[PDB]
Design an enzyme around this catalytic site. Structure first.
Site, PDB file in Angstrom:
ATOM      1  CE  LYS A  46      -4.166  -1.621   1.018  1.00 56.73           C
ATOM      2  NZ  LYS A  46      -4.899  -0.329   0.862  1.00 56.73           N
ATOM      3  CB  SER A  49      -1.675   4.456   1.652  1.00 55.83           C
ATOM      4  OG  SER A  49      -2.126   4.864   0.371  1.00 55.83           O
TER       5      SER A  49
END
Ligand SMILES: [Fe+3]
EC number: 3.4.21.-
Length: 315
Positions: A72, A258
């Site tokens: 991510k 993220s």
């Protein structure tokens, strides 16, 4: 509790630069930057995802991977190339060969090739994607590397599985376990390593970017000893890349978590390092410069800066 931006260096040389980046940052009173040493991009991607570091620059090849679970990571800034008067966040993937040869792009079969590294953009994804048709590859499960190790007689694709595809590491100049390593420990690593592989006479073709020949040659005459393979199956002189390239691609980029990514701080670090240590900015340190015998450490040598990736919340 001083938590600075912790950068992920892949390999010793990079580590060293990060450390230099650090003292100079402290010297000039800019935000601080700390250094974590890893051995591969993936080792870095992981550290970042598990809070052992915050940022690293990745080739457009790994950006996609890095964004999938469980990783991510998301790009925060893109490298900027060109010149000040004309800057760009893209570059050109070209195939460079010695002038004097007859073969065209469609006649690479059985030849010796040099690549920047496995999964990178100009050095692998683009060329291989283009040569697809001639590869006679019967899709997966069979690895594309398998198809390529049988199209070229020999190659150097740093990062490739030496044990499975020994053909793909045959041309690499690294010593022992570093031979074919996806790191600066491998001399034919990256754009300039790939080009060096051609210049040294190990390969017949180098898949690199448009500026390499320009960046690498101390004598402009020597540029004449090279040319580009265009996709219309012709050859053009090196400065014709705008009319002779396999593709126009987006720049390398800095990625981060993220979630709890410190984007704002990373960005601030970069904006400052570039103002102080950018092109022709300081006689003391060049953020976009690597020592004699190393190249593209942490960032693309001779890049000119960074461009912030637009705002994201949905991610
Ligand atoms: Fe690239």
């Amino acid at each position: 509790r001083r938590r600075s931006v912790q950068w992920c260096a892949v390999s010793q040389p990079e580590a060293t630069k990060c450390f230099q980046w650090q003292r100079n940052m402290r010297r000039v009173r800019g935000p601080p930057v700390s250094c974590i040493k890893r051995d591969s991009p993936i080792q870095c991607i992981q550290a970042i995802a598990e809070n052992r570091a915050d940022a690293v620059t990745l080739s457009g090849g790994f950006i996609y991977e890095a964004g999938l679970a469980p990783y991510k990571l998301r790009p925060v800034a893109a490298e900027v190339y060109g010149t000040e008067r004309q800057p760009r966040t893209h570059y050109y993937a070209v195939a460079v060969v010695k002038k004097g040869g007859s073969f065209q792009l469609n006649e690479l079969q059985g030849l010796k090739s040099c690549h920047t590294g496995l999964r990178r953009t100009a050095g692998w994804n683009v060329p291989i994607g283009t040569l697809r048709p001639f590869l006679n590859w019967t899709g997966p499960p069979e690895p594309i590397e398998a198809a390529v190790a049988r199209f070229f007689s020999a190659s150097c694709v740093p990062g490739a599985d030496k044990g499975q595809f020994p053909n793909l590491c045959r041309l690499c100049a690294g010593t022992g376990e570093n031979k074919c390593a996806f790191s600066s420990q491998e001399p034919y690593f990256s754009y300039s390593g790939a080009f060096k592989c051609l210049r040294d006479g190990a390969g017949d073709v180098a898949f690199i970017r448009e500026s390499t020949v320009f960046e690498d040659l101390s004598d402009e005459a020597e540029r004449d000893e090279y040319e580009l393979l265009c996709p219309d199956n012709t050859r053009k002189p090196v400065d014709k890349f705008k009319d002779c390239h396999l593709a126009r691609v987006p720049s390398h980029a800095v990625v981060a978590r993220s979630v709890n990514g410190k984007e704002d701080a990373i960005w601030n670090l970069l904006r400052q390092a570039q103002e102080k240590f950018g092109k022709d900015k300081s006689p003391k340190f060049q953020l976009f410069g690597s020592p004699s015998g190393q190249k593209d450490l942490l960032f693309k040598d001779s890049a000119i800066g960074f461009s912030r990736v637009p705002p994201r919340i949905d991610s």
